[PDB]
Amino acid sequence: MASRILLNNGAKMPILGLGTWKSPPGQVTEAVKVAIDVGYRHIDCAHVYQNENEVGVAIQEKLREQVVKREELFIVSKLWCTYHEKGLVKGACQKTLSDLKLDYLDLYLIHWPTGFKPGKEFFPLDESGNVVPSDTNILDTWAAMEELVDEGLVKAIGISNFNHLQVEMILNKPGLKYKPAVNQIECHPYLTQEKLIQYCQSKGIVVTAYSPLGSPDRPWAKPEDPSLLEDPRIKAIAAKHNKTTAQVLIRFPMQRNLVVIPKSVTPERIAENFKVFDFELSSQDMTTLLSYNRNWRVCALLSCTSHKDYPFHEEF
Numbered sequence: 001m002a003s004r005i006l007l008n009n010g011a012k013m014p015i016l017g018l019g020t021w022k023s024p025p026g027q028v029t030e031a032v033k034v035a036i037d038v039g040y041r042h043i044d045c046a047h048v049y050q051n052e053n054e055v056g057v058a059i060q061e062k063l064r065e066q067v068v069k070r071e072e073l074f075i076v077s078k079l080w081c082t083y084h085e086k087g088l089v090k091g092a093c094q095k096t097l098s099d100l101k102l103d104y105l106d107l108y109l110i111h112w113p114t115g116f117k118p119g120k121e122f123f124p125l126d127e128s129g130n131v132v133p134s135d136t137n138i139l140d141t142w143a144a145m146e147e148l149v150d151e152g153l154v155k156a157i158g159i160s161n162f163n164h165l166q167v168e169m170i171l172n173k174p175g176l177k178y179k180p181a182v183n184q185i186e187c188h189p190y191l192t193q194e195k196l197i198q199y200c201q202s203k204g205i206v207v208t209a210y211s212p213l214g215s216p217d218r219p220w221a222k223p224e225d226p227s228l229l230e231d232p233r234i235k236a237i238a239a240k241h242n243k244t245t246a247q248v249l250i251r252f253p254m255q256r257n258l259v260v261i262p263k264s265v266t267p268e269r270i271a272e273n274f275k276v277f278d279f280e281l282s283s284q285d286m287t288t289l290l291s292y293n294r295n296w297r298v299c300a301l302l303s304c305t306s307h308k309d310y311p312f313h314e315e316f
């Protein structure tokens, strides 16, 4: 299979990208340099990750070195929840562009459907500990995203962590100018997401799978939690194919016509994770991996369950 997928804006998006959540700022510049050196052309970023300046240093060096041309890169970032107000969207995008040292993004996502009160804190709290919401309608945020396309700041816009009803609300927006190109959601063998993926794909929205390895480094992990990388059944499929378990976990979404964004700052793993274009899982393998679904959501954003647009009360 082909290394890029066609988006509904006419651009091609690499199906493998490098994740950067929790990539330490003192390690991420070299991680991105290594990634570009071994062939990655898609980097998944976000303002809330607090490391865009350092990601940008790597991108700029590789452009300067002429290792890659800007048109060959596919750089993604995301609008944080405290910038859903229509008048804040452009400045948020511009700050990301400034930090990444770019003059456009390939794709800019609404990071979550939940808007929060603007201010310095990424999770503004009331005195009782609840996140303080914004009253900005997500449709107004969407119009502000559309303006970014029309001003040349971004080539494509999309969404992340939207449930199917929330996707539908965007698709049904009165006067919709640009459809979302992508919905970026958690997806792996323990949270296979059939219903949401089918819905999005049926509407021409490309799905990006995040936490494809189950985010073993997540801060809220418990020692007894299920572990994809240690699942002997997945290890066995990997062994059959002479690949690593991580390589199977990355190839799996690729064969579902998804984009996938494994994170690493370890040079040998960055390289390992890219070596996924030289084998094929059988249909039986694919169905077997799908059968491991748990409905086990690792990124549930539990602090925000009191939000009216909190996405995970709905079945899908």
Ligand SMILES: NC(=O)c1ccc[n+]([C@@H]2O[C@H](COP(=O)([O-])OP(=O)(O)OC[C@H]3O[C@@H](n4cnc5c(N)ncnc54)[C@H](OP(=O)(O)O)[C@@H]3O)[C@@H](O)[C@H]2O)c1
Pocket: 018, 019, 020, 021, 022, 044, 045, 111, 160, 161, 184, 185, 209, 210, 211, 212, 213, 214, 215, 216, 217, 229, 246, 247, 261, 262, 263, 264, 265, 266, 269, 270, 272, 273, 299
């Ligand atoms: N839109 C959203 O709300 C959202 C939510 C979650 C994630 N994301 C995006 O998706 C990306 C990926 O998800 P994630 O970071 O949660 O988790 P992940 O990619 O599932 O797992 C990352 C972890 O796996 C380790 N690892 C990477 N490759 C490995 C390999 N070949 N063998 C063994 N261990 C390996 C990494 O360690 P080292 O780095 O130490 O090598 C790190 O601890 C994020 O970085 C972010 O860009 C977006």
Ligand SMILES: Oc1c(F)c(F)c(-c2c(F)c(F)c(O)c(F)c2F)c(F)c1F
Pocket: 021, 046, 048, 111, 220, 298, 299, 300, 301, 302, 303
């Ligand atoms: O892109 C991310 C994000 F916006 C998050 F909120 C989270 C996240 C978080 F910051 C949290 F604090 C959580 O409790 C949680 F479940 C999350 F998914 C995350 F892991 C991401 F990778």
